[PDB]
Point group: D2
């Protein structure tokens, strides 16, 4: 069917991309980077994230596949030596699709609104000065956070920034998001929960400014300074990312291979 | 309907129990501690845990209610001053039931099998010497754990031992269990994941002895030395605990009230 | 003797400053903010830090005193109601001096050199992109750090940023500095020590760029973007800050009062 | 001079011990395990700890040396292949001695007193039930600890149990001890400092029972149940352990080799 291939851009990934295109030419596969049905990413997890954001408006029509040209990427879970086997299996199709949950981030301003989708996480920091936000969960004031920032992670993002912040690793069949603290201050007058928090679908987490209304907001690799922010709202998206799966590579085995040994 | 009341046993809880029994006597309520349909616990969370384990073979026929005579208990979420209001609302019924997930623990021996249900968590430590187990997830060898022990928590247990071990706090609508480490050793030859792990329903986590086969296994307050252990298996139970709910007391508000301020 | 008084600048601190100046006028005390021998800070710890940096070139000629107008400040350990008692005791003198260690930070450039003194800590982050430095301890390559940044703390700084990063609290009679990580990445290819590190006098810790040579370097409240950095060197300073002490207020009691209860 | 050699007891360590004894026989060296001046430990860090405790009453007359027959031991920092080189250098002498600080533990009872010396750490846990102690620092009540236990570490012990508990790694030229928590409970009624605490010489840390007076107290590998405990006192010992050093192996390089890569 229609497919496209993105490359990290080094000589090794470009050559693998050219060889796969040549192999696809031997099948009823059409290269189309406007309306692909398969998106192949050749590089690392950064490359895969750029592919996801390149096509985040057609997520329900696309199955993604990652090939890692360096060491094992968490989303890019094919080795370059297996590219021909992958061309052949994709060409026939009949593969099964697997879906991971996504995070929806809404940024409200004063006197419109922007929404973003994250595959790993969205974070919030101040624009230079102290970072202070009120954390409101389902319209209930939960805590006033003082510290470096906050991180809201998807399940597949839990092995990324979330992990370095002390968060739990969560299986991606769980439709949830996870909020972790960056260096909270805690004394007898300033108090946060400390622990990571895991939220189900339909729970809304709202960050509201206390003094400064300018924030540095990241969504995956993208980081933008937002001014005149009234609110930042987090919820599990209704949208999901779909992967083409051709063999068993369980999440916990992927975790083992990335952090324990391989 | 049929009900019973357990008390922590101090003078204050016994008197509240006697007064509630007297108030129930003014309604079509029969005291029956063999086949209750309502189980009221007066005391603390320890009292509530004993009530749950007293009736864990009739969980689907029972709705639980906790009254906290000390500071706020996480399961015991009525104040003693509200006991009369609670008698009246229970008597009429028409309340809604809320369900929390439970943890199933299976202990296998050599040359039978024991199962246990946990509302907070189950933990494993050695019987005195070094603690070393292989952690197997869905039949996949994940890590060899060396350290003080391991803790497997339910969602409502995540605010208990799990929290002190660095675990995430998880909303109890999520059907999951969470595994946390106790003082793992990590150097260039011994390696664990470090991070808490969150598992969905139908995932099985198996601990298998490496040298010593004797372990101290806790389930909630109960702690027993098990000998000749071949395997300890954790999974989300199919069984659930049901609470009688008469007003909104959201989980995240309960978390706020217990750890932030009240 | 010669003295000066700095104020946080709100109405309450300015009035206390004016009243102390009036009280000092009744003694052989001369107001001199060029060559003071006593520097009184009225405000919070931020105010005290600005006072220290205002006079960091005459530290050996100055004894510092802090008055906290809000809740207890860690350096500002007199209440406003005790200001008159403090005027009287300072006027007579015969007080004892207590000394805390300081941190020296050297920043080297390519094709000069800048040094800074810190009372709380110095931190390093990237100028926007990924943060990667090689950590060299006494000319020995120790680790390649990948993450958000690094924090080097004095002993009295250990209750500040260092504490939020998981660092140990160290008694200020110990002449040491403490290095803590901010969100290090650790997988099977990236590896850091994780643990805070505590260094004695005469040990030198050097951070050396790997790719990007631009860094955001903080020293206490001051944060500056440094370009073309070749090296950042940390060592315990030979210089010390001196406090005027009039009564026993032990460090561990100050810790208790700030974080446990008061 | 007078020397002795302890072995872990496996075939490999016994053979190395016999060969070193044979090599020492070619010099003016006398085997004496009553009053040695050199104590050689062949095995692992457990073997080295047993050697230290075998001779803890003659620490000022003894220099210790460790040979690691498995992977690098932190105290046992010679490889077996270097044993002959070590025999020759010891025989001539003229080596330099290096000293590490030790921890003194005093256990007081009701109606005598026991003291112990630790090279790694001393820990305290309950005898089965809840662990609750009051932590008193230089006669000042600091906190009431509720949790699994407490760990007091020497500097060279900071890479051992202390590290797994989140403690800082401290250079052994610093005369200090470090207190770390094991799974403290923290809510709005129970409160501990959380952070590791680092104490200088002459500071005394006293643990005092609240309800139960029975405790499991470890000193290095030894663990004893103590009954009728009135107090447990920790301070940096006046005694030190002395190592024979023949070449530079800096502490931070030893840390790198054990935890980063080798
Ligand atoms: N400079 C520090 C950041 C860094 O080196 N990131 C790349 C590494 O992270 C791995 N990775 C990614 C990825 C990626 C691409 N990243 C770079 C780009 O796109 O340019 C952006 C992501 O960076 C993460 N991140 C940022 N700061 C971090 C920090 N302090 N600690 C840990 N992660 C941090 C955020 O989560 C962000 O989404 N996703 C996952 C995943 N879901 N599971 C496990 N591994 C994963 C990837 O294989 C590399 O090994
Ligand atoms: N001695 C230390 C343990 C202790 O003081 N426990 C009682 C306190 O914990 C609170 N609590 C309980 C409870 C209870 C009754 N417990 C006593 C009994 O039954 O005798 C047994 C439970 O103890 C926990 N536990 C054991 N060791 C712990 C440690 N090191 N750190 C933290 N928790 C620890 C385990 O999880 C066990 O299930 N369940 C929850 C909950 N789901 N959410 C939030 N708070 C909760 C309760 O209101 C008290 O404030
Ligand atoms: N916006 C977050 C930062 C913040 O609120 N800081 C002020 C609070 O911290 C207390 N404080 C200070 C102080 C101060 C003045 N600070 C403000 C100014 O000068 O404008 C600059 C300092 O900020 C610290 N800091 C920065 N980011 C932090 C973070 N994420 N977590 C914790 N601390 C953080 C750094 O260490 C810096 O030196 N020194 C100590 C001390 N030695 N012992 C115990 N308490 C202390 C002070 O009483 C306030 O309660
Ligand atoms: N079963 C868990 C404990 C364990 O495997 N211990 C041996 C390993 O630890 C290394 N080690 C030792 C040692 C030793 C001998 N140990 C065994 C014996 O004597 O039988 C007793 C010691 O055990 C430590 N320990 C106890 N529980 C622990 C836990 N949960 N996490 C981490 N350490 C733990 C305590 O501190 C105790 O003193 N001293 C140091 C040191 N100063 N620097 C760095 N590495 C060091 C040694 O090379 C092995 O790699």
């Amino acid at each position: 069917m229609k497919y496209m291939i993105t490359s990290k851009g080094d000589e090794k990934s470009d050559l693998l991309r050219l060889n796969m295109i040549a192999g696809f030419g031997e099948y009823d596969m059409e290269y189309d980077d406007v309306e692909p049905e398969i998106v192949i990413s050749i590089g690392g997890d950064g490359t895969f994230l750029s592919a996801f954001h390149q096509y985040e408006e057609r997520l329900d029509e696309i199955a993604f596949i990652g090939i890692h040209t360096g060491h094992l990427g968490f989303y890019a879970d094919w080795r370059p030596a297996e590219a021909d086997k992958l061309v052949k299996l994709l060409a026939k199709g009949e593969y099964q699709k697997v879906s991971y949950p996504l995070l929806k981030t809404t940024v409200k301003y004063g006197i419109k609104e922007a929404t973003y989708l994250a595959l790993n996480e969205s974070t919030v920091k101040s624009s230079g000065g102290p970072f202070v936000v009120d954390v409101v969960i389902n319209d209930i004031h939960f805590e006033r956070f003082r510290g470096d920032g906050l991180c809201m992670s998807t399940p597949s993002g839990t092995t990324a920034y979330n992990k370095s912040l002390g968060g739990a690793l969560m299986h991606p069949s769980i439709e949830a998001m996870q909020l972790t603290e960056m260096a909270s201050i805690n004394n007898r007058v300033y108090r946060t929960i400390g622990s990571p928090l895991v939220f189900p679908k339909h729970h809304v987490v709202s960050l509201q400014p206390v003094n400064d209304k300018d924030f540095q907001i990241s969504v995956d690799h993208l980081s933008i300074l937002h001014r005149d922010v009234q609110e930042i709202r987090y919820e599990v998206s209704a949208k999901k990312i779909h992967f083409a799966r051709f063999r068993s590579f369980p999440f916990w085995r992927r975790v083992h291979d990335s952090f324990i040994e391989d």
